[PDB]
Amino acid sequence: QFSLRVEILPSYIPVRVAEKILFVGESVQMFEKNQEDTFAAELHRLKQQPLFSLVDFEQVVDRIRSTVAEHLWKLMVEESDLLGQLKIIKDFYLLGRGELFQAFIDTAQHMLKTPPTAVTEHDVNVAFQQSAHKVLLDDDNLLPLLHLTIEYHG
């Protein structure tokens, strides 16, 4: 998790490209062919220029930016399916699968009108687990990933 600096940033460099730099790099450090050497020739080329031309500094950054972004979108959607994951969030977070909750509310009702204690946190995770099976939803995937929390004592 890196950040950006402004109190040391140059003057003639705009913050817009500064943000572009901060993203194109972190998208590599986190991520742990021909798209590698050719840009090295581009950067080296600028080192030969006897005059710093911002109008050209962006035409090399933005292409590098758009290439990694195009490469990242390929993974964030196709390989790592986002649609399936968003479909999970809409169902459970946003009450998309409301039919699961009317049963969970039907069961785990008396154990919540009382003030919360140190034991109620587990008294509901089971009831929620009794619920998913009560709606014939049988999937060991994405079932243990959902853990209800009880903000107790603060």
Partner: protein, 404 residues
């Protein structure tokens, strides 16, 4: 979950075609097998079916009848193997008193079957009843079952699809008595769908197979959202609370040959069509009590709001002066062709239904003054001494009419 109690020839058939429609919708094979294309289905099946170790699905249905012929024919159909032979019941060997007497006689086995079916469901919600109120079988047997059920299960809903006798056509000569008694029992025990052959066949025009296909269509469209979970209206009790006698109407009641006119069908035009008396399948500035419109297919809530606004401004409807509709949306089954771009079903409570009883009362009063066809009734124990039952039933119906 839910149970279905269908009585008499009318109810037996009603059930046959209702389950035909259901298995068509959910991709259930005639034998109870599941088709390959429907293996990964998302549709909820527990509501009307329970699966078996053999992977087949069994309806939560019970067959009752005073006579064997109808069910025997059913078991000769391609759908025969689907039903549960254990649940089906047939009398070993046309009057309401006789029907109720038999009901008193065969309490034990019927309630055995009902209990067995009930204990197999974790979250049973209510009951569904399909029967005719005129014939001897349906009327009396439904009366007895409703009484003993409301007594046995005081925490379950009881929904019925009661078929009313034709009146313009002069079928049961003793229909007034059976109808009046069944209505007594319905008011005194039934939680909540009136049906008449007259207007039903009128709309069909303008065999029992097609009539009851339409009726099963109505039932399935009523239960769609429950079958297909969504966001709102995820329970039968939600339905009932939003309305509470009823009448129904369905827009896309089109023959298999009448698909040629693929009319651009908005939501506005449908919801409008559901309002006209013509589409109300049943036959004093009488007004409404409640209206519900369930819409299938693509739907934009902006369109729904616009339609509601325009209809409200056009004041095509009338409401009670002493009290302050509803438009729910569902999703079509992914299997049956979507020949209709958007479709609509309407269930409403309207005061005009009172007239029905006024006719039957008029019919009944038109007989009780001359003691017509009471000889058979005196035979049974219930009417062996007197007929105070009849007087109480008539006064109850009169009270209901006054209340309306």
């Amino acid at each position: 979950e839910i149970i279905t109690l269908q009585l008499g020839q009318c109810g037996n058939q009603i059930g046959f075609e209702f389950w035909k429609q259901l298995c068509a919708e959910h991709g259930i094979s005639p034998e109870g097998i599941v088709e390959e294309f429907a293996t990964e289905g998302t549709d909820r099946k527990d509501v009307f079916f329970y699966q078996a170790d053999d992977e087949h699905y069994i309806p939560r249905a019970v067959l009752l009848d005073l006579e064997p012929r109808v069910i025997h024919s059913i078991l000769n159909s391609p759908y025969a193997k689907l039903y549960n032979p254990e649940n089906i019941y047939l009398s070993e060997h046309n009057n309401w008193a006789s029907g109720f007497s038999q009901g008193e006689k065969i309490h034990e086995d019927i309630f055995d079957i009902i209990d067995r079916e009930a204990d197999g469901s974790d979250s049973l919600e209510g009951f569904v009843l399909c029967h005719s109120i005129a014939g001897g079988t349906g009327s009396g047997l439904g009366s007895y079952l409703l009484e003993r059920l409301n007594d046995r299960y005081p925490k379950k809903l009881v929904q019925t699809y009661s078929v009313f006798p034709n009146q313009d056509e002069m079928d049961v000569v003793v229909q007034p008595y059976n109808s009046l008694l069944t209505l007594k029992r319905l008011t005194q025990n039934a939680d909540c769908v009136v049906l008449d052959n007259t207007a039903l066949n009128r709309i069909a025009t303008d065999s029992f197979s097609q009539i009851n296909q339409l009726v099963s269509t109505i039932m399935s469209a009523s239960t769609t959202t429950l079958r297909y979970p969504g966001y709102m209206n995820n329970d039968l009790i939600g339905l009932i609370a939003s309305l509470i006698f009823l009448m129904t109407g369905y827009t896309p009641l089109t023959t298999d040959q009448s698909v040629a006119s693929v009319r651009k069908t908005t939501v506005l035009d449908v919801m409008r069509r559901l309002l006209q008396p013509k589409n109300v399948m049943v036959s004093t500035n009488h007004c409404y009590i409640a209206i519900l419109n369930i819409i299938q297919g693509e739907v934009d809530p902006t369109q729904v709001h616009k339609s509601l606004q325009r209809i409200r401004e056009r004041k095509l409807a009338n409401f009670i002066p002493w009290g302050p509709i509803q438009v729910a949306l569902s999703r079509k089954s992914p299997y049956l062709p979507s020949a209709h771009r958007v479709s609509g079903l309407m269930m409403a409570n309207h005061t005009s239904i009172s007239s029905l009883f006024e006719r039957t009362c008029r019919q009944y009063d038109k007989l009780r003054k001359r003691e017509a066809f009471l000889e058979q009734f005196r035979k049974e124990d219930m009417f062996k001494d007197n007929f105070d039952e009849m007087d109480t039933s008539r006064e109850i119906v009169q009270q209901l009419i006054d209340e309306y």
